[PDB]
Structure 1
Amino acid sequence: IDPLEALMTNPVVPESKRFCWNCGRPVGRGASEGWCPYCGSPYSFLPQLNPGDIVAGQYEVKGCIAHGGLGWIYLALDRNVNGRPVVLKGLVHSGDAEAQAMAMAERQFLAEVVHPSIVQIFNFVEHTDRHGDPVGYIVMEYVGGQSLKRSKGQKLPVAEAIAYLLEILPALSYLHSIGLVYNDLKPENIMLTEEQLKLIDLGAVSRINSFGYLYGTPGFQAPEIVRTGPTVATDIYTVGRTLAALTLDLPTRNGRYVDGLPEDDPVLKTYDSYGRLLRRAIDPDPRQRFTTAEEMSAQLTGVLREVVAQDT
């Protein structure tokens, strides 16, 4: 019937997928919102915007498209820009009126990030929910497609994965070039559309030597990020990990991928130079890794050429 219904999903988190954001424990097992019995953190799995709601008098909400780290991802029409679809994501699990307002300022700089292979941020907006409480939303480009997220039985051939990350590295270079790192590179964060690849999640983007270390997904984070903070080197590491996760059979512990490589992997015995590149990328010592994304790109170009050649 209506073409937009298809892009969207049923706005309930099934009980299976319901966990606390602060402790990982399966809350809502069946209150949809409330406080976690085990850590006292507030949670809600209910959509905070509903179809028909109009945010900042500009964004007409049509419903939800996914649910993730911070809650629901909403799809809205932008009534300024010819009713083109955009995405609304929240900013913090909770805060007062001041905290939300602060949260937006901490993230306001993302405006300036402009590259063909990164989601465009359009706007940052307040919505007064049913309770007079103001909630901050980031407005961003709706990129239709699927993530490169591949589970055990659907791992990408090496040629294809390399091709993808060669499209991504430029975007990292760009970020690096303007004093920024994309701390959260992983298959789940790269979207393959009918045209191109895009990076979608800018919640981890930071400045080089930005305060703290709470940047990005474990199993992909470089080991030294606690002491170094986010650096080009920690980004390079995520790339090696991302390539690993796309192509190799990685063991897990407690849902997280294990550090290092399954050192006797079929794929890795096969593509001698790819394996060497992977190893260089994720080297425990930041200094042993590729010094630049451009550098890694150049060497990874070589490896593609070698991989295609060996494929016959």
Structure 2
Amino acid sequence: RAPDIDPLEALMTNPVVPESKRFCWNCGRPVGRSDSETKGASEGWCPYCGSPYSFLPQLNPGDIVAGQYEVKGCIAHGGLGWIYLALDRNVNGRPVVLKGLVHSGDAEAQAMAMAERQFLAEVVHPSIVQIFNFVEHTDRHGDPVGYIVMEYVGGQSLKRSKGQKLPVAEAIAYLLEILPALSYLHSIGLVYNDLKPENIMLTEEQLKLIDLGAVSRINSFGYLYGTPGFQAPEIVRTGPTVATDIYTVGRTLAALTLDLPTRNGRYVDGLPEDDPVLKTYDSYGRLLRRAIDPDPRQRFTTAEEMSAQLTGVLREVVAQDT
């Protein structure tokens, strides 16, 4: 007899953060580490900045959030802590995903965080993860914390290491599917702000953008955070813009296709000279340089314009590959 297995079990991870992956959310320094003297604590305070940390899950299997979401366990751990899998009692017990909103804060701070992100529930595009709700629950210490509720997205991110870079045609075809989602965001006065391979999910059917935490209004300065090697150099002066999102498209294509030099764990600005890929596909190299131009006024004016040039480049890459 063949067994009846719950397919959710294979989707979840052991709810322990390995020591090599423990960092302070505030100052970025390693925390919760074992030394030649003492064992690393799963929760405590950062010895350098004094910020509280916890690598323990804040929602346990069987917990019910806002009388609606039945927690099943953990999917992954990130910058905002654990990412939980839950079953939505309003939508037939469909598995959904919960993620925290702020690393720390009192009741008023949590309420303000939920309210400021509520607009994401109105973002509707087939290539952008759907946000279903914003809910409150108590953490492992009894203090109320806010959660974003989102659609469960299948597959894995486009993040590729030095040995598994995508062929140019594949990477372009992927970004051509992403660019209309950016055009859609720009049409409603929003910037995605966090485009990078790790935030793009590849499913059995399509591509989907996740991690809407950086989504912001054009020319606003409330959120300036970004990854060195992906973020536009002028973000401090202009705030997020269509031009900063175009720059991230260029950086994303480069990170998916090129063996980019890295320094202190981040990709260096610009593109390497004599790179075999850029010498092979000239129009592609020209498009990337335009997209990452240090002058934002020199970049593609709109995502629709970039898509039009990119379509032309795909035809040329496909023809060259023969």
Q: Give me the TM-score of the superposition, normalised by structure 2.
A: 0.95
**Matched-pair contact (CA < 8 Å) for 1:181–1:231:** yes
- In structure 2, how many angstroms separate the alpha carbons of the residues matched to 1:251 and 1:41? 33
- In structure 1, how many angstroms separate the alpha carbons of the residues matched to 2:132 and 2:226? 23
Q: Deviating runs (4+, > 4 A) in structure 1?
A: none
- In structure 2, how many angstroms separate the alpha carbons of the residues matched to 1:149 and 1:80? 33
Instruction: State the identity %.
Output: 100
- In structure 1, how many angstroms separate the alpha carbons of the residues matched to 2:176 and 2:140? 46
**Matched-pair contact (CA < 8 Å) for 1:45–1:71:** yes
Superposition map of 1:169-180 within 5 A: 169-180=179-190
Q: Give me the TM-score of the superposition, normalised by structure 1.
A: 0.98
- Displacement of 1:263 in angstroms is 2.0
- Displacement of 1:130 in angstroms is 4.7
- Displacement of 1:214 in angstroms is 1.9
**Matched-pair contact (CA < 8 Å) for 2:128–2:210:** yes
**Matched-pair contact (CA < 8 Å) for 1:32–1:45:** yes
2:93 corresponds to 1:72: no
- In structure 1, how many angstroms separate the alpha carbons of the residues matched to 2:154 and 2:141? 32
- Displacement of 1:211 in angstroms is 2.5
**Matched-pair contact (CA < 8 Å) for 2:224–2:240:** no
**In structure 1, the residue corresponding to 2:230 is in which secondary structure?**
coil
- In structure 2, how many angstroms separate the alpha carbons of the residues matched to 1:64 and 1:216? 25
**In structure 2, the residue corresponding to 1:233 is in which secondary structure?**
helix
- Displacement of 1:251 in angstroms is 1.3
Q: Residue by residue, what CA displacement relative to the aligned partner does 1:26-71 show, whole Å, maximum 9, x if unpaired?
A: 1110101110011111111111001000000000000011111111
Q: Residue by residue, what CA displacement relative to the aligned partner does 1:3-28 show, whole Å, maximum 9, x if unpaired?
A: 11111111111011111112222111
2:254 corresponds to 1:244: yes
**Matched-pair contact (CA < 8 Å) for 1:213–1:225:** no
- In structure 2, how many angstroms separate the alpha carbons of the residues matched to 1:122 and 1:51? 21
**Matched-pair contact (CA < 8 Å) for 2:58–2:140:** no
**Could you tell me which residue of structure 2 aligns to residue 13 of structure 1?**
17
Q: How many residues align?
A: 312
- In structure 1, how many angstroms separate the alpha carbons of the residues matched to 2:15 and 2:251? 32
Moved more, 87-96 or 23-32: 23-32
- In structure 1, how many angstroms separate the alpha carbons of the residues matched to 2:8 and 2:219? 42
**Matched-pair contact (CA < 8 Å) for 1:207–1:230:** yes
Q: Residue by residue, what CA displacement relative to the aligned partner does 1:194-233 show, whole Å, maximum 9, x if unpaired?
A: 0100000100000001124524322100000000110000
- Displacement of 1:118 in angstroms is 0.2
**In structure 1, the residue corresponding to 2:149 is in which secondary structure?**
strand
- In structure 2, how many angstroms separate the alpha carbons of the residues matched to 1:66 and 1:210? 30
**Matched-pair contact (CA < 8 Å) for 2:230–2:248:** yes
Moved more, 213-222 or 83-92: 213-222
Moved more, 214-223 or 84-93: 214-223
**Matched-pair contact (CA < 8 Å) for 1:158–1:307:** yes
Q: Which runs of 5+ in 2 are unaligned?
A: 34-39
**In structure 1, the residue corresponding to 2:314 is in which secondary structure?**
helix
**Matched-pair contact (CA < 8 Å) for 1:51–1:61:** yes
Superposition map of 1:113-152 within 5 A: 113-152=123-162
- Displacement of 1:80 in angstroms is 1.1
Q: Residue by residue, what CA displacement relative to the aligned partner does 1:230-272 show, whole Å, maximum 9, x if unpaired?
A: 0000000000000000000111122111111112210010000
Q: Residue by residue, what CA displacement relative to the aligned partner does 1:142-194 show, whole Å, maximum 9, x if unpaired?
A: 00110000010000000000000000000000000000000000000000000
- In structure 2, how many angstroms separate the alpha carbons of the residues matched to 1:256 and 1:24? 15
Moved more, 13-22 or 241-250: 13-22
- In structure 1, how many angstroms separate the alpha carbons of the residues matched to 2:200 and 2:251? 13
Moved more, 123-132 or 101-110: 123-132
Superposition map of 1:31-50 within 5 A: 31-50=41-60
Q: Residue by residue, what CA displacement relative to the aligned partner does 1:121-146 show, whole Å, maximum 9, x if unpaired?
A: 00000012354311100000100110
**Matched-pair contact (CA < 8 Å) for 2:12–2:74:** yes
CA shift in 2, pair 1:39/1:5, >3 Å:
same
- In structure 2, how many angstroms separate the alpha carbons of the residues matched to 1:99 and 1:151? 38
